[PDB]
Design a protein around this ligand. Structure first.
Ligand SMILES: *[C@]1(C(=O)N[C@H](C(=O)N[C@H](C(=O)O)[C@@H](C)CC)[C@@H](C)CC)O[C@@H]1C(=O)OCC
Length: 251
């Protein structure tokens, strides 16, 4: 395996890999990390490009994935993809796809032109219909996964999985010092625990001798490093290597 790897550069024909979304005022990171990686993999293993709907995952999976905007289970999200499939759907107010995201973007721990995010956000309804004007039908727009699995808490195995099959979804414990991340390789040193947070891991590298994972957060582009961040790799830091999940699209 190479010393560094960036899925964005390795798969130039898959622009979703470079995208950063905004989960809004809703604890749906479990859903976002999943649909983002799934969007990437559908493109990687079908070279079609599809903006997988975070809305469909968030609202229709149900208990199998947890509790909507109250948090969820990543592995459950990939299961939904293989069992019920996912329709397309872009960003809030984009009118792209069957079910675009319905929760407005906001400012996540940073100042900006958008309204500040609020902790309170209710899970939207599971509506099995597409926006007006979009074709085909909700049912016909479903994209299915043909496998859902968990990658071991093993650095090399995780790197090999990304290297071969594309970005994966992971999760780690967020402490307050992470909220102000701007650059460099994040290492937890202080702050009250905020809770678990699911994200998309799309690569790795070494910065100033410190090994790291290249990660895409779902707090828009004005947070962190253009929406991305790097976190210590190889020490299961904050549990970053303890909950890796992925899957393969049906062919
Ligand atoms: C993952 C999650 O969504 N994380 C939360 C989060 O992202 N919070 C947002 C923030 O700006 O910090 C706000 C705007 C949304 C309400 C919290 C916990 C992290 C700081 O509860 C989700 C989950 O399913 O986690 C289990 C992996």
């Amino acid at each position: 395996l190479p010393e560094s790897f960036d899925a964005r550069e390795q798969w130039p024909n898959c622009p979703t890999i470079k995208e950063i979304r905004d989960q809004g005022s809703c604890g749906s990171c479990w859903a976002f990390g999943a649909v983002e990686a799934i969007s990437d993999r559908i493109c990687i293993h079908s070279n079609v490009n599809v903006e997988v709907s975070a809305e469909d995952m968030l609202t229709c999976c149900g208990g199998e994935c947890g509790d909507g905007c109250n948090g969820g289970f990543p592995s459950g999200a990939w299961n939904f993809w293989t069992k019920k499939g996912l329709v397309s759907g872009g960003l809030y107010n984009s009118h792209v796809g069957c079910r675009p995201y319905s929760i407005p973007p906001c400012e996540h721990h940073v100042n900006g032109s958008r309204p500040p995010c609020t902790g309170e956000g209710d899970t939207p309804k599971c509506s099995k219909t597409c926006e007006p004007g979009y074709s085909p039908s909700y049912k016909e727009d479903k994209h299915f996964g043909c496998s859902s699995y968990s990658v071991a808490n093993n650095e090399k195995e995780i790197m090999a999985e990304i290297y071969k099959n594309g970005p994966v979804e992971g999760a780690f414990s967020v402490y307050s010092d992470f909220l102000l991340y701007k650059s460099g390789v994040y290492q937890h040193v202080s702050g009250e625990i905020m809770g678990g947070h699911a994200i998309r891991i799309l690569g790795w590298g070494v910065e100033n001798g410190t090994p790291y994972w290249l990660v895409g957060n779902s707090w828009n582009t004005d947070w962190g490093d253009n929406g991305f961040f790097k976190i210590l790799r190889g020490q299961d830091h904050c549990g970053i290597e303890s909950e890796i999940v992925a899957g393969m699209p049906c062919t």
